[PDB]
Design a protein around this ligand. Structure first.
Ligand SMILES: O[C@@H]1[C@@H](O)[C@H](O)OC[C@H]1O
Length: 183
């Protein structure tokens, strides 16, 4: 089960996040800047199988629902995006991976002098983005090893030092509400 609660916001707009029982959380936001809220594990694993049920995911504008985390050495931000609002995230196309009943496009991207778990840094993003939005309110599994190994085949090797790993609600200049249980 989960051991970690993440509640990060850049302070722009109103973001109200609740650390509920077990692996459950909720977040309501209005005209946010950027925020990342979710539950998961303080140390990510490339072989973790993550389950979640989004009782609600209703962005009004740009919001994502993703398996989300960081490695260091090198500094990499990674996503497995199952749902989004008005904006589907993309980068440089690398291929596809089919996992847990969905097909995901794979992308890389460079972020130059950008916010990160270690402050302003130049780093890389690894993305799997579902080709269509996954069903909301169902018990959904992300078999992360499939994504890790699909990424490896394209030279997207994750860092050797693992930071947190969560099912994250992320908003960008938007409003919305989400309620999610992770295990
Ligand atoms: O973990 C936070 C990350 O989610 C955000 O993107 O940049 C600052 C970090 O502390």
């Amino acid at each position: 089960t989960t051991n970690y609660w993440q509640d990060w916001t850049d302070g722009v707009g109103t973001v109200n996040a609740s650390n509920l029982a077990g692996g459950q959380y909720s977040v309501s936001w209005t005209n946010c800047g950027n925020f990342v809220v979710g539950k998961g594990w303080s140390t990510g694993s490339p072989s973790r199988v993550v389950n979640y049920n989004a009782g609600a995911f209703s962005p009004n504008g740009n919001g994502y629902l993703s398996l989300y985390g960081w490695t260091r050495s090198p500094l990499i931000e990674y996503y497995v995006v199952d749902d989004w609002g008005s904006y589907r995230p993309t980068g440089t196309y690398m291929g596809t991976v089919t996992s847990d009943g969905g097909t995901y496009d794979i992308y890389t991207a460079t972020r130059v002098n950008a916010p990160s778990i270690d402050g302003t840094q130049t780093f890389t993003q690894f993305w799997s983005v579902r080709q269509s939005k996954r069903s909301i309110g169902t018990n959904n599994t992300i078999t992360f090893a499939n994504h890790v190994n699909a990424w490896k085949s394209h030279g997207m090797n994750l860092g050797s030092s693992w930071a947190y790993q969560i099912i994250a609600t992320e908003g960008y200049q938007s409003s919305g509400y989400a309620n999610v249980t992770v295990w």
